[PDB]
From Swiss-Prot:
The keyword Protein biosynthesis does not apply. The keyword Nucleotide-binding does not apply. GO terms for molecular function: rRNA binding; structural constituent of ribosome. Keywords: Ribonucleoprotein, Ribosomal protein, RNA-binding, rRNA-binding. Belongs to the bacterial ribosomal protein bL9 family. This is Large ribosomal subunit protein bL9. Coiled coil: none annotated. GO terms for biological process: translation. It comes from Thermus thermophilus (strain ATCC 27634 / DSM 579 / HB8). The gene is rplI.
Amino acid sequence: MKVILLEPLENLGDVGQVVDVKPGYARNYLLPRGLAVLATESNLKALEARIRAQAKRLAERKAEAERLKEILEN
RNA sequence: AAGGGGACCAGCCUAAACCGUCCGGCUUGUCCGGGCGGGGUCGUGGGGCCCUCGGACCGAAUCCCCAGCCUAGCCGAAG
Ligand SMILES: [Mg+2]
Ligand SMILES: [Mg+2]
Ligand SMILES: [Mg+2]
Ligand SMILES: [Mg+2]
Ligand SMILES: [Mg+2]
Ligand SMILES: [Mg+2]
Ligand SMILES: [Mg+2]
Ligand SMILES: [Mg+2]
Ligand SMILES: [Mg+2]
Ligand SMILES: [Mg+2]
């Protein structure tokens, strides 16, 4: 059963990452303890969109940073 | 059972794409979701979206009116 992890998890996987595990573990451990959610399509969009936002504001930093580089140095 | 002879006869509304708006969630938006509206309904495949061109006839199974009918009756030839 595919699920997206909410936390860095011992020898299962990384925060934000999508993994495959036996149904009961998802249903009766992970999901209730809030360490993950169903890797559904509906909130696969949510993941994919935040990935976009974190990539948006980060390289946006390197943009305004590099622009202040050019002002200075000269 | 198909087929043939007949009775009767009538076909429609949605879901999804996409678009709009209200609402709440927390993981703040090109977000996910739930309402309502618009769009759409097909098998010669159909629909959405994007370009070019084209710009009144139909019509209910709903509603209203009326005939007709039902729920009392009446006229009715000639010892
Ligand atoms: Mg027959
Ligand atoms: Mg027949
Ligand atoms: Mg008959
Ligand atoms: Mg929705
Ligand atoms: Mg919406
Ligand atoms: Mg909506
Ligand atoms: Mg087509
Ligand atoms: Mg109808
Ligand atoms: Mg009499
Ligand atoms: Mg008499």
